[PDB]
């Protein structure tokens, strides 16, 4: 199944934050309306925030996360969770190797803001 | 000249607090006797208190503050101020970019406590 793709309400601000847990440098691309809207990159084995950004979901609301290490796309797992019918989380994990801990790059999208 | 290095009275409790004023995520490390004793991290352009902690200066009393943004060390400014010969402040400012506001991570050490 397709992973890392979320349909948000249109024209809505959201936060996107990426953490790194891998000896390989993580590259996180955030697409809105099928166009690159933000790119993070960093290396950490200690969950360091390699990027955090406020973006707008645009007219389509389609937000997509991609993760790659040294040009190799990582395998993605994702889900969306909604608390008290208001607070939304779009969660992404990624795996760049073989140990299958899927924390190599962790991406959290949250909305609404403000 | 060296910045962010302070000699405190030995074996004295001191407070260390970090504020963030930057789009880049700040990482503040506090070393006591050249050993990492605390690490704060956060991203804010509105002076969020990304960390505060009570540490012990130990037998050496040597305290050093380091600031980094996604692996790149920030340039530091520092000084110590003593009020009415009793109240101590060790102040650190840091610059991670080019605008030279030196508030990107602001670290305040204060002693004595209690």
């Amino acid at each position: 199944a397709t992973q890392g793709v979320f349909t948000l309400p249109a024209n809505t601000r959201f936060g996107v934050t990426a953490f790194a847990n891998s000896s390989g440098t993580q590259t996180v691309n955030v697409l809105v309306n099928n166009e690159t809207a933000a790119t993070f990159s960093g290396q950490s084995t200690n969950n360091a925030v390699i990027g955090t950004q406020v973006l707008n979901s645009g007219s389509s609301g389609k937000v997509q996360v991609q993760v790659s290490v040294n040009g190799r796309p990582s395998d993605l797992v994702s889900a969306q969770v909604i608390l008290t019918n208001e607070l939304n989380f779009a969660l992404v994990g990624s795996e760049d190797g073989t140990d299958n801990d899927y924390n190599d790059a962790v991406v959290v999208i949250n909305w609404p803001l403000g | 000249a060296t910045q962010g290095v302070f000699t405190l009275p030995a074996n004295t409790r001191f407070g260390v607090t970090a504020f963030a004023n930057s789009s880049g995520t700040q990482t503040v490390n506090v070393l006591v006797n050249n050993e990492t004793a605390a690490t704060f991290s956060g991203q804010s352009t509105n002076n969020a208190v990304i960390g505060t902690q009570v540490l012990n200066s130990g037998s050496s009393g040597k305290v050093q503050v380091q600031v980094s943004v996604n692996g790149r060390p920030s340039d530091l400014v520092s000084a110590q101020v003593i009020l009415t010969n009793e109240l101590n402040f060790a102040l650190v400012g840091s610059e991670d970019g080019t605008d030279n506001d030196y508030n990107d991570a602001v670290v305040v050490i204060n002693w004595p406590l209690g």
């Binding site: 690159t36 933000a38 955090t52 | -």
Partner: peptide
């Protein structure tokens, strides 16, 4: 740099 769209 900006193309890319490298952001913090």
């Amino acid at each position: 740099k900006k193309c890319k769209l490298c952001l913090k």
